[PDB]
Design a protein around this nucleic acid. Structure first.
Ligand SMILES: Nc1nc2c(ncn2[C@H]2C[C@H](O)[C@@H](COP(=O)(O)OP(=O)(O)OP(=O)(O)O)O2)c(=O)[nH]1
Ligand SMILES: [Ca+2]
Ligand SMILES: [Ca+2]
Ligand SMILES: [Ca+2]
Ligand SMILES: [Ca+2]
Ligand SMILES: [Ca+2]
Length: 901
DNA sequence: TCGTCTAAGCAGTCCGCG
DNA sequence: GCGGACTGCTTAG
């Protein structure tokens, strides 16, 4: 097999690399890597190295990495560009792995761990590490084993050994329900003291040294706690054994309001799963506790115990250990589903970066582009300092707030990357500028043609057409990968709909789920077999189809995020290829493209319907248009359709055979007008929306920009078994909206869109009557909480104190003196409830840490004083009045002359 | 919330608006 | 009450 790196570090003048050799074995080596950098040189000097602009360069070979770094400094002192890859480990990987890396994940040691620390006096601060570590569960992916290190004797209590037999039993047997599929994979090690536990942990770690290290909050909690605790007990040298190169660094992570410390372990790649989840999941959650996320992702019940966590070990050590094991397993289950580790390895090896660098699109693109240019003996420019400057983005059309019965939407495939490719936008392809007309003049094709030579953007930039820039070349490669995975995702989705249909008629038999690849559209043979399957088999198949869809989603959406991130990186001052000329070339072209095509679509449809000045495009945002199809349906007449699926078919056909060819023609003209390199503006139909045939549903509504709802029957070629709501921006989609309120508002919208006014009025009346019985957590608003200290004046709200911060201050006063009460953590999320006039808390609201029950000390008082009236008006009635006034209907029945009887 | 970008919505504070 | 200036937070893209 081909060799591949596991980790790489620079330590002084050495590269330390862990790698898999040609025999599949893990090795480590120290290499006195001599880096090269570059300087511009005269024409007369013959060289093979050229900078991205074609200027000749001489290569400078350094005796060591420190010499190279010092040279860079002196070049700055002189005022001359020092060219080349200044991150020497990236240069090392590029030299050592000069081919497309094929990696074997089965050889990569992925460790998932979690620790427990009993603490009487509140949260155990990792930088202090003053409390014993009393449990560690460490899963090793190569062994496929959970290694459990259990402390039996502690200053906080002596306990009995954990029992695997009780752990395996049902909760209803008094057991812990540790899943049977992991029972035989547990290696349990009890210890009579913490020193021996930690010494044995370190010896184990030496034997089974993680390459990828993950878990939940491991970077901010578990790693620093373990490092600092070992440091406190044994000294620094012992703690540094967590690094295979015995080198660690405290790294200060800074943000707007403060900073925190993490421990960098040289020779390990830490990918904290909470951070992987935040970057790759495309969710915004009210809480990021593992229990909350586990419930959301896996539909598993919260890990239930009595008393505070600080007393769990002494009261129920059995459960304490079991829950530690389950916590580790839950992260593995989330990963089995989401496949974020797989994604990280894919992107990391593709770019040839340290795997942990997948968190940084700038680092990722820097490496991809460097490797690409190096292949042609081209030399990358020095990174420069730039001041942060605002620049313009997308165009968003102001919609007329209204109901919209029939809607078809269209949008560009990978819009910004396609613009980069079409225009040929790259650092080295800038050809010059032209005199810009107002955007409106390009949109309306009255401005003079920008260039007869170069490819243009309406921001005034011109680009070479003779050859692809490195940015278009590399962005295309990742786009092609994204397209492959999106294909698999969409097939799995369509396959899921076939199974849902079959589930209407499940057969009474005992059989098995079919062994199929859900990434490919089901053959006729498979479809026939599906129609004969039991509900049990069909449901298992649906689960598997949906898991395949999730895997495809992760792979496609994050590759889309990577390529969109390059468009963004061009507008970030830390990017080597920062250039506001290019960043704005993209966004300004986009503004034109949208408004150009709005004009073209309106023109096409006015012609088809034989009208003039009629607005068919009702809305658009960035790269999308929403077209009213009422007139198209009416040209046929509703009574001519057999059912809903019949008109959906008709619109699908109209979009594919009439609309899209008109759109394509419109964009081809725009490409010619801008003299672009290649036509790549592909605006395919997204949604087909409308009410059920014969219903009083309104189909859709807009309240304003980025705020709308649509009843969708077909989405990107997926024909749904049941209509699905596409809701954007409304309160149902916001993590700040109470859970039960999102639910209720979604049902109000469903009724509006599918059933009509009377149905909405029936539901509203019921919700208003019953909502006070809803659990307090389900009706609490959620907010992130920043700058709590800024607004805290002697425990009371200072000037301009935000509502949620006021709630936190109320909470802090209510729990004052308690070392044990859950503290609100700066920058994390809180639940917020309004309080009735004259409450004991002395203010109008209270807030507490999200994802948790409020502490028992005050729970009773909160429940008693919760202001249901304010809650209802603010979170439910206000948004609903917004929806209904936009859609021109009433959520309450107005009086009529019929009331006289 | 360490980690690519801008546009734009709504909640809430403070205070004007005769 | 509402709106604007402003902060804070959260979306759509
Ligand atoms: N710089 C930057 N631009 C973004 C980001 N998200 C969206 N955009 C811009 C770039 C996208 O191409 C454009 C349109 O967004 P879409 O959500 O329609 O995605 P896109 O067209 O890329 O992919 P699609 O093929 O429609 O799934 O909006 C981002 O995180 N950073
Ligand atoms: Ca725990
Ligand atoms: Ca798009
Ligand atoms: Ca599409
Ligand atoms: Ca059947
Ligand atoms: Ca779009």
């Amino acid at each position: 097999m081909k060799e591949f790196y596991l980790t790489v570090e620079q330590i002084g003048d050495s590269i330390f690399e862990r790698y898999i050799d040609s025999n599949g074995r893990e090795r480590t080596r120290e290499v006195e890597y001599k880096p090269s950098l570059f300087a511009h040189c005269p024409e007369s000097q013959a060289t093979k190295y050229f900078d991205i602009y074609g200027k000749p360069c001489t290569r400078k070979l350094f005796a060591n990495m420190r010499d190279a770094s010092q040279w860079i400094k002196r070049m700055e002192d002189i005022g001359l560009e020092a060219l080349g890859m200044d991150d020497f480990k990236l240069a090392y990987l590029s030299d050592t792995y000069n081919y497309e890396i094929k990696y074997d994940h089965t050889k990569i040691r992925v460790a998932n761990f979690d620790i427990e620390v009993t603490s009487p006096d509140g949260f155990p601060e990792p930088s202090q590490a003053k409390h014993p570590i009393d449990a560690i569960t460490h899963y090793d992916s190569i062994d496929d084993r959970f290694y459990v290190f259990d402390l039996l004797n502690s200053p906080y209590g002596n306990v009995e050994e954990w029992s695997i037999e009780i752990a395996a039993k049902l909760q209803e047997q008094g057991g812990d329900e540790v899943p049977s599929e992991i029972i035989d994979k547990i290696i349990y090690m009890p210890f009579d003291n913490e020193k021996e536990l930690l010494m044995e942990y370190l010896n184990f770690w030496q034997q089974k040294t993680p390459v990828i290290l993950t878990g939940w909050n491991v970077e901010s909690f578990a790693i620093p706690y373990v490092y600092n605790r070992i440091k406190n007990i044994f000294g620094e040298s012992t703690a540094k054994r967590l690094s295979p190169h015995r080198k660690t660094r405290v790294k200060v992570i800074e943000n707007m309001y403060g900073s925190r410390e993490i421990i960098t372990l040289f020779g390990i790649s830490v990918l904290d799963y909470i951070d992987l989840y935040k970057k790759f999941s495309f969710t915004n959650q009210p809480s990021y506790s593992l229990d909350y996320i586990s419930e959301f992702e896996l539909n598993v019940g919260k890990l239930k115990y009595d008393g505070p966590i600080s007393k769990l070990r002494e009261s129920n050590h059995q459960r304490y250990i079991s829950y530690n094991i389950i916590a580790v397993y839950r992260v593995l289950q989330i990963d089995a589903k989401r496949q974020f580790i797989n994604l990280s390895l894919d992107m990391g090896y593709y770019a040839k970066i340290q795997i942990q660098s997948v968190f940084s699109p700038i680092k990722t693109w820097d490496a991809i582009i460097f490797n690409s240019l190096k292949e042609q003996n081209k030399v990358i420019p020095q990174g420069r300092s730039h001041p942060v400057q605002p620049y313009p983005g997308a165009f968003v059309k102001e919609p007329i707030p209204n109901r919209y019965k029939y809607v078809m939407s269209f949008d560009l495939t990978s819009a910004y990357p396609s613009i980069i490719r079409q225009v040929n936008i790259s650092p080295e392809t800038i050809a010059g500028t032209f005199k810009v007309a107002p955007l409106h003049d390009y949109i309306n094709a009255v401005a003079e043609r920008p260039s007869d030579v170069y490819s243009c953007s309406p921001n005034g930039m011109m680009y070479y057409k003779d050859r692809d820039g490195v940015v278009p070349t590399e962005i295309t490669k990742v786009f092609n990968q994204r397209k492959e995975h999106k294909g698999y995702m969409l097939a799995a989705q369509r396959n899921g709909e076939i199974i849902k249909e079959a589930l209407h008629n499940p057969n009474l038999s005992v059989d098995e789920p079919l062994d199929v690849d859900y990434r490919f559209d089901f053959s006729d043979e498979i479809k026939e077999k599906i129609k004969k399957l039991s509900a049990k088999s069909l449901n298992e198949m649906l689960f598997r189809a949906q898991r395949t869809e999730v895997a495809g989603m992760t792979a496609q959406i994050n590759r889309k995020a990577l390529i969109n991130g390059l468009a963004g990186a061009l507008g970030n001052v830390w990017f080597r290829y920062y250039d506001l000329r290019n960043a704005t070339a993209i966004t300004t072209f986009g503004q034109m493209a949208l408004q150009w095509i709005e004009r073209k679509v309106n023109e096409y449809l006015n012609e088809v319907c034989g009208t003039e000045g009629e607005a068919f495009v009702l809305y658009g945002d960035t790269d999308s248009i929403y077209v009213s199809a009422d007139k198209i349906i009416d040209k046929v007449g509703e009574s001519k359709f057999r059912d809903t699926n019949h008109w959906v078919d008709f619109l699908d056909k109209f979009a594919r055979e009439r609309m899209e060819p008109a759109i394509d023609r419109g964009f081809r003209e725009m490409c010619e007008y801008m003299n672009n390199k290649q036509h790549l503006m592909f605006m395919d139909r997204e949604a087909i929306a409308g009410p059920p045939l014969g219903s009083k549903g309104i189909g859709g509504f807009w309240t304003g920009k980025k705020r709308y709802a649509l009843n969708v029957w077909d989405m990107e070629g997926t024909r749904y078994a049941e209509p699905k709501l596409k809701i954007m921006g409304l309160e149902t989609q916001k993590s700040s909206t109470p859970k039960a309120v999102q639910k209720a508002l979604k049902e109000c919208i469903r009724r509006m869109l599918q059933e009509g006014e009377e149905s909405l009025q029936e539901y509203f009346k019921e919700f208003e009557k019953e909502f006070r019985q809803l659990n307090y957590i389900s009706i609490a608003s959620v907010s992130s909480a920043n700058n709590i200290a800024k607004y805290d004046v002697g425990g009371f709200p200072g000037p301009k104190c935000p509502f949620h911060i006021r709630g936190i201050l109320t909470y802090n006063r209510a729990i004052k003196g308690n070392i044990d009460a859950p503290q609100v953590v700066e920058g994390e999320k809180v639940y917020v409830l309004p309080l009735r006039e004259g409450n004991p808390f002395g203010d109008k609201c209270i807030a507490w840490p999200s994802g948790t029950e409020i502490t028992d000390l005050i729970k009773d008082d909160v429940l008693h004083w919760m202001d249901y009236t304010v809650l209802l008006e603010k979170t439910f009635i206000k948004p609903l009045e917004g929806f209904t006034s936009a859609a021109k209907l009433d959520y309450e029945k107005k009086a009529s002359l019929f009331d006289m009887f």
